[PDB]
Design a protein around this nucleic acid. Sequence first.
RNA 1: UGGAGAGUUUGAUCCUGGCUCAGGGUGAACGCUGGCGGCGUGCCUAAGACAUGCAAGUCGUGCGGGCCGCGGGGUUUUACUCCGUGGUCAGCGGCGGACGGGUGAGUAACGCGUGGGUGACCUACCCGGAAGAGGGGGACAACCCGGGGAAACUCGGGCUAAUCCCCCAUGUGGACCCGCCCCUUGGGGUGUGUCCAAAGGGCUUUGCCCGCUUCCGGAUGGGCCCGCGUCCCAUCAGCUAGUUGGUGGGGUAAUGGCCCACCAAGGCGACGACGGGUAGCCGGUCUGAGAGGAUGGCCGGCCACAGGGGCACUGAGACACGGGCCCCACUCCUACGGGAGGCAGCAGUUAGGAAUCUUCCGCAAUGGGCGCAAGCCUGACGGAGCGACGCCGCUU
RNA 2: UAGCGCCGGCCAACUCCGUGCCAGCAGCCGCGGUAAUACGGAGGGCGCGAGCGUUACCCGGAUUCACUGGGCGUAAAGGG
Lengths: 570, 122, 59, 99
Amino acid sequence: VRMDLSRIRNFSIIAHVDHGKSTLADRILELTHAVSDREMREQFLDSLELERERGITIKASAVRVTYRAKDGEEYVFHLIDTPGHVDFTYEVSRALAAVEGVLLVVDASQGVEAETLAKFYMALEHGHVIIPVINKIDLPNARPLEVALEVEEVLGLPADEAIFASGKTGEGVEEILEAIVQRIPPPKGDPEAPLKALIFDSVYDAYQGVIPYLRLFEGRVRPGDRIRIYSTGKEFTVDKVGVFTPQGLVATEALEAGEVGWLVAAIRDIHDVQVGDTITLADRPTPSPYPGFRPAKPVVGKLRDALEKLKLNDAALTFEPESSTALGFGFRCGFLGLLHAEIVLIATAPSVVYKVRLKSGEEVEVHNPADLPDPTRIEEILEPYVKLTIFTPEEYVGSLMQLLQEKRGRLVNMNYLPGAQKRVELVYEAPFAEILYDFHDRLKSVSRGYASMDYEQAGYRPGDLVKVNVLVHGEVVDALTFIAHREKAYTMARAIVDKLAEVIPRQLFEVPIQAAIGGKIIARARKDVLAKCYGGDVTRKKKLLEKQKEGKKRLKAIGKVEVPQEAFLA
Amino acid sequence: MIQPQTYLEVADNTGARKIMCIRVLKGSNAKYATVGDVIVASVKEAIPRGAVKEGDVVKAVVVRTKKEVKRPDGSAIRFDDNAAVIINNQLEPRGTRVFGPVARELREKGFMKIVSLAPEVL
Amino acid sequence: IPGEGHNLQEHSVVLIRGGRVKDLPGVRYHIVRGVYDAAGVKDRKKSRSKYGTKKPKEA
Amino acid sequence: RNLSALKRHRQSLKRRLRNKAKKSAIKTLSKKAIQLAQEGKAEEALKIMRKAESLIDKAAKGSTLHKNAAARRKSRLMRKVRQLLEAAGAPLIGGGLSA
RNA sequence: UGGAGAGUUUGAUCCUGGCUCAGGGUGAACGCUGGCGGCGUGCCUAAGACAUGCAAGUCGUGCGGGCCGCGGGGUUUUACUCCGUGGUCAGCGGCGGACGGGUGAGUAACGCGUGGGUGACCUACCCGGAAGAGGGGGACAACCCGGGGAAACUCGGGCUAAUCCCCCAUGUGGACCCGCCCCUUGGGGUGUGUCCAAAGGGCUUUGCCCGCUUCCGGAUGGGCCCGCGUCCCAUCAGCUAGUUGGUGGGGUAAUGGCCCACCAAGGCGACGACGGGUAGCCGGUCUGAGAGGAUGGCCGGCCACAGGGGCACUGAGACACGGGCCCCACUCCUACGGGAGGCAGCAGUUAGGAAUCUUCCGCAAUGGGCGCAAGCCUGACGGAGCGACGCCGCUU
RNA sequence: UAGCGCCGGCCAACUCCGUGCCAGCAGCCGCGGUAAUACGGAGGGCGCGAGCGUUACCCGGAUUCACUGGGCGUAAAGGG
Ligand SMILES: Nc1nc2c(ncn2[C@@H]2O[C@H](COP(=O)(O)OP(=O)(O)CP(=O)(O)O)[C@@H](O)[C@H]2O)c(=O)[nH]1
C-alpha cells in the first residue's frame, strides 16, 4: 500500500471459548469487499467451509484492512487472531507472542474465564498492550455495566476503555478502529536491516510453492531471491509476497518491514519438518530472531502409515510401533482428543509401555505388556514419573490434592506465587500413562478447566504395579493384563473383566471366564427338550435330563477352542 | 409405488440395474412406501469390480409406476421404478446418476444437491 | 534378517533385493540395515557399507 | 477457453447443404433418365443427361466432385442409354450421344 | 588381423554334467561420501488421474461494419454525416487447422523390412508450358427490431458487401459413349453430337503487383496389390455362411463380395492354420573370435491410437491427439434453468509403485504458417535450471 | 573436498588381541566348539578412485543347445 517505513502495528482479539472471535473483523469495515450475493456469510475468513458443521474455526490467517481512517494512517496493522479454546493455543501459540496487543470482547453471558488469565500470561513475555472491550448488545437479559466493571476487579484492569460495541451488529467496533491507532503501540518499520523475520503459520503450496508468510520486522525483501535461516535453508528464487488477501493469491510487490506478507515459491511440496524457527529470510548478517516459536507437549495393513497430513500442527504421535497383543489399532492418538474425524480404528485411550529391569541385569529388555511372559520374579516394574508444575486460580487445590493422589502422589513442593491472586503452584510427581486417563477431563473440572500443566517426568527404582491378568475357561484369553498397582487389581475388574460377554455366546455351555490376574481368581463374570413328556414323571424327566448333562462334561473338554476373541476389546 | 421387499430398480451405484428392497423407514405401521422417502433395501444383481459390493444399505425413492398426486395435481406416471441410494444419514455416494427433471423428488428437501445430478434424458 | 541388530515385529515396512544365504531352503532375501524403520548395527566399524551405517567421527 | 476456429465447422455447415443436395440431384435425374430408359423416351433422358452434365461440372466449378467418378456417372448413365436404345430404341438426337 | 579360464565328488584317480566366479554393459539401484567443469541423459510399472497459465494463424495491398482515435469539414447553431483513415475489436471471406509434441497400449497381420506393381491412380501450394480472364443475377454475418436467458447464449423477421454461389455466354481445349488408326487385359492418336470454362484487388493510369481459371510438362507426395523376410506354446487337430469364386450390379482418387442380389459350391489346413500365450515393428544397440545370441526405449521410418467406442463431414490430402455427431464412464460449474470440458502436448500435482526432472528464459539464429512486404506466433528449439544418473577432463 | 570394498582357497595381498559351536559372514567349498588368518577389534596390505561395493538383468565365458563344433552300448536315454 505504498505505506513505507513507519506506521503499522500489531493487535489481536483473543478471548475465551465461544466469544465471537470472528465478529469484529467480519465485514462492513467500509473497506468495501465480500459481496455479490456470495458474501463471506457468517464466520468468513476462508476457513474451509467444512467447519460449517459448527463454525468451529481452526485458526485466523490473512484478512488485512486498507483504508478506513478519517485521513490518517490509512491502514497499518495486522489482523490475525486464531480462535478456539485451549485447543490450539499452545500449538498455535506461534501467533501468540507474534503481534503486540490483543483485542477481545468479554461474553455478556459466561463472561471472563480461564482462557482470559492464561491468554494474558502470554501478552507479557512478548510485550503487548491490553485491550478490554465488552461486546454483545447486552442481549435480551444481561448487564452492561456490572459485566464490564467485573472484568475490571479480577483482571486488575480499570476503565481502560472498551465500548459495548455490542456483539450482534450493533456498534461493530465503530470506535476501536479510530482508537486502534491511538490505543496501540508501534512495531517500528526500519527501512532496512539484516531481515529479521520469524516463520509464521504453515500454508501448503496449493500446487506450487508453500505459503510461509513472514514479516520483515527489521529489513526489506523482494521476489525471486535467495534465503538462509539457521539451517542454511536450501532454497532459491521465489514469487513476491501478495499478502493474506480475501480470495486467490494477489499481485503487487512483496511485503514490507513489518507488514503481513506470505512467502510463496522456492518450495514445492518439499516437506521435511522444515516448519522453521526464525525469519527464515536472508540477505545479510542479521542475528537470529527472538526464539519465540514453539509449542509444548501433547497434553493428552496400511490406512496411512504416515499421517503427514500436516505434521506442522500434528499433536505428537508418529504412530510409533506399539506392541499390543490385540489388533493394536489406533496408537498414540489419545493425546490430541477433542479433535478427530478425518476421512478414510479404536482409541484404546492409554498405551503406556514403561521400562522393565528384570533381575540378573537385563536392562529395559524392551518393556511392554506382552514382551516375554513372567519368567523370573519381577523387579517391581519401575519406571519414570512427572512432577506437578501448573499454575491455578483461587483455591482449587482442594480438588487437585485429592484427585492428584491418583498414584501415590507425592507433594513435590507446594508453592504460592506472590503479588498474584489465588493463583498457586502445586507440585507432585506421578506416572506417564496414568496421567493419560481420567486426568485431562478432570484437570479442567477439578479447577473448572483453569490453568494448564507442564512437566518433564521423574521417578524410578521402585513402584508397585503387579500384573493383573484374567480368566476365561480356556487360558491366556485374548491379550490383557498389565500392572495392577494400588489395589488396581479389582479396580477395573468389575469393569474390563465384565466385558459384557464377548457379545457372542457360542454354545450353551456357559464357560466361566474369570480373571486369573495372579491368584486366586478375582473377577466373577442348552436345549429345552426336558419339558415335553408333560404332566408327570419327575423321573423320566431326570432320565432325559442327564443325557444332555453328560455332554457338558464331554463338551467343554473336547470342544477345544471355545475362544471367541476379536470382538470389541471392551 | 409402495413396497416391503421387492425387485425395485436401483439405477444407481449398484454394478447392475436392480435392488431388492427391505422396507419403509419411519412410521412402524405404514406398509406403503411413499415416494419422497428413504428406504432399506439391497442389491441382488452383480457388479463390475466397483465398490459398493454385496451387503446391506439404507437409501431413497425415485419415481413410482403407481399413481402420484400433486397438491397442484400435476401428474406423471412411468412403467418403471428406479430409486435413490445414500450413504450415512444423508449424502449420496455415487456422483453419477442419469435421470430427468421430475417433480416430487426434491420436495422432501432434505437433499437438494441431488437434483442437479440427475437432470437428463430418458 | 541379515545383521546383528534385532528389530521390527509383526509389521515393519522395509525393502529387499535378497542374496543367497545358502543355509536354509527357499529363503533368499537379506534386507539391508537402516532402510525405512529397520535399523542398522553400529560399532562394527569397517564394513559399514553393507549393514549400512554412516561413518562416526572416530567416536 | 475461446479457441476460435469453430469457423470451419459452421462455415462448412452451409456447405453440407450445397454440393450434397446437388450430388443428390444427380442421382434423381440420372435415374429419371434411367426411368425414361425403360420407356423409349430417350430424347428426354438425354436432355436430362445434358442437365446431368451440367451438375457434374457445377461440382467441377470448385471443391465438390469429379475424379473418374463423375465420368462414372456419365458413362454409366449413357451406357444405359445405349443398352436400352438397343432395346428397339431407334435413337433420336446426338445431343445425347456421339453421332 | 580374433577366440586365458579356475573351482568344487570321493580314501584316492578319470570321465558325463550340473553348479557358480573371472568380461563388459545397459534409462537403473541402497551404501558411503559427496570439489568443479564439460557432455550426455532421465516413466521402460494403472493407457489412472489429472488445478490453475500455454501450445496455430494472420490476412483493412479480400470484403463491409461495429469500436476509439486524427483533424478537416459535408455543416450556422444544435451538430454530427463525413475526407484521409491512424488504428481497433469481431465478423465474412482466404490458406494451415493431418507437419511439428506424445507415448507404444492393444494388434502376429501385408501392418513394417526388403524388393517389386502402379497396363486398374491422386496430388493443395512447385517451376516450366498453352494460356485464359464477358455479361447477369442472388444470398449471409454483424446492423435494426422483436424473442428466451445470472451470464454465456439462444429465436424469428427486415436490410447489406464482395476473390461467395448461382446465371448463359465464350472456347488455345478438356470429359464420357459409340467408330477408327498405331501398342492389343482402362497404351497412344483421330471420328461427330452433347457436355464444360472462371472475381479482381494492390500500385506510382496503363503498366506494374498478388491472385483468379481449364489444360500440359515433369518435379514432389501419397496410395494401393503382390515376392520374400518377419515371436513361443501341437496337452489348441480341423475350422471357416461375405467364409470361395462366377455373373451383374453397387458405391467408392483408383481394384477387389469393400457391399447387394443372384449363380455356384466351397476354401484353407502337419511346409503349420483355425487357436492360445506374447509383442509397434524395422534403423538398430549390446554381447561375442567368428559362428552366434539377446534385446529394440532417448536419434530415424512408417502404423497405431490418440477419455472408452463408433461414425461420418469438410475437404489438396484425414477418420481429425488444442473439431463435429452420438453413446459409455468421469469431471468440475450452475443463479438449479443449465453447463463446459478431456494434459498418453507442454510445463507441472496426486496416485502409482524402488525408482525418475525447472509451474526456466527467450524470438537471437536455426524450423514452419501467414503476408507482396513490414509484420507476427509458436514451452519447435535454443541455452540455461537440477539427479556423480551415465559419460570425458578436472585438483584435493 | 578422500574414500568404499577387500584379503581360506580359488583369484591378489599378514598378523594381532576379542571372541570361544554363540554371535557369525559367506561367489564356492563352507570356515569357527576356549591358542580360529573366513567372527569381533586394531594395524597392515590390496584394489580402484571421487566414486567404490551393491543386487537385477544381459549375453559372454559355455562345445552347459551342437549348422560351424557335440553325444546318446554300462555313465542321461534305441521306441517291443
Ligand atoms: N445473540 C448473539 N449472538 C452473537 C453475538 N456475538 C456473536 N454471536 C453469535 O455467536 C456465533 C459465534 O461467535 P464468534 O465468536 O464470532 O464465533 P466463534 O465463537 O469464534 C466460533 P470459532 O471459535 O470456531 O471461531 C456467531 O456465529 C454469532 O452469530 C451476540 O452478541 N449476540
